[PDB]
Amino acid sequence: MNPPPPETSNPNKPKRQTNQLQYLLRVVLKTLWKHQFAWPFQQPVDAVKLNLPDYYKIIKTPMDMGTIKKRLENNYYWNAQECIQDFNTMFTNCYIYNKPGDDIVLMAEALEKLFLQKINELPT
């Protein structure tokens, strides 16, 4: 079955808002979220609904944009790099589990290229 989703809150961690984290939520995440290809990435991979019995043997660090969105909304991230790392993990998991040329891989590739375009405009 599925593991519990990644934590989206950490009560022991202090919180702050930064210009880069605001930009990651309001521009980066929002832009990817509305993309034609976003739906498969808007929530944790559900291995029982999608019938993927080996998914969590192969992918031990799941990540998805629904989790990233809640993390941003909950001020879970202290450093903007934490959020960028989660996006990268999401994309890399997709490339590891699936085969090159699969529909989902070409969708991740389009989302990643757009992610990189938006991250390039991150404010100082």
Ligand X SMILES: COCCNC(=O)CN1CCN(CCn2c(CCc3ccc(OCCCN(C)C)cc3)nc3cc(-c4c(C)noc4C)ccc32)CC1
Binding site for ligand X (CB under 6 A): 39-41, 45-46, 49-50, 52, 94, 97-98, 103-104, 106-107
CB of residue 55 vs ligand X: minimum separation in angstroms? 7
* Residue placing its CB nearer to ligand X in the complex, 7 or 46: 46
* CB nearer to ligand X: pick between 106 and 116: 106
Helix orientation angle between 65-73 and 80-97, rounded to the nearest 10 degrees: 170
Taking the least distance from each CB to ligand X, the nearer of 46 and 73 is 46
Closest CB to ligand X among 8 and 98?
98
Residue 123 C-beta: closest distance to ligand X, Å: 29
Smallest distance from ligand X to CB 86, Å: 14
Least distance in Å: CB of 96 to ligand X? 9
DSSP string, the chain: -PPPPPP---TTS-----HHHHHIIIIIIHHHHTSTT-GGGSS---TTTTT-TTHHHH-SS---HHHHHHHHHTT--SSHHHHHHHHHHHHHHHHHHSPTT-HHHHHHHHHHHHHHHHHTT---
